[PDB]
Write a protein that binds this ligand. Structure first.
Ligand code: NA
Length: 129
């Protein structure tokens, strides 16, 4: 599923991501934009041989199992394929664990490089939330 911007904002809010660990909804929508372009089916191979999965490009090195990331963890206790579903529940539940890990949203390099410090509220502009 390719979410609309406000459609994804509404879904993230419903699942309690808005101001989760003190990150406003616009931060999460901004991260999703630059990680996945709002595409639940987005997959990207990392140089270390791990893969990033779904709207928030959750890495198989730590968070989900894909069966092909040697020496990796599955700290969200999910198959990485569950992160590609049209229903973002699994991605959000796993993102809540990632952002609680100590470095907040800096875990998402694209958030640090493209969203951090910017006018992230622009990403929920005009949304009925
Ligand atoms: Na893994």
């Amino acid at each position: 599923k390719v979410f609309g911007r406000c459609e994804l904002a509404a879904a993230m809010k419903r699942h309690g991501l808005d101001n989760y660990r003190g990150y406003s909804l616009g931060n999460w929508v901004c991260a999703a934009k630059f990680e996945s372009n709002f595409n639940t089916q987005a997959t990207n191979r990392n140089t270390d041989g791990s893969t990033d999965y779904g709207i928030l490009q959750i890495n198989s090195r730590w968070w989900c199992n894909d069966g092909r990331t040697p020496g990796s963890r599955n700290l969200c206790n999910i198959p990485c394929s569950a992160l590609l579903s049209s229903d973002i529940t699994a991605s959000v539940n796993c993102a809540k664990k990632i952002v609680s890990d100590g470095n907040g949203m800096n875990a998402w390099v694209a958030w640090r490089n493209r969203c951090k410090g910017t006018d992230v509220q622009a990403w929920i502009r005009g949304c009925r939330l």
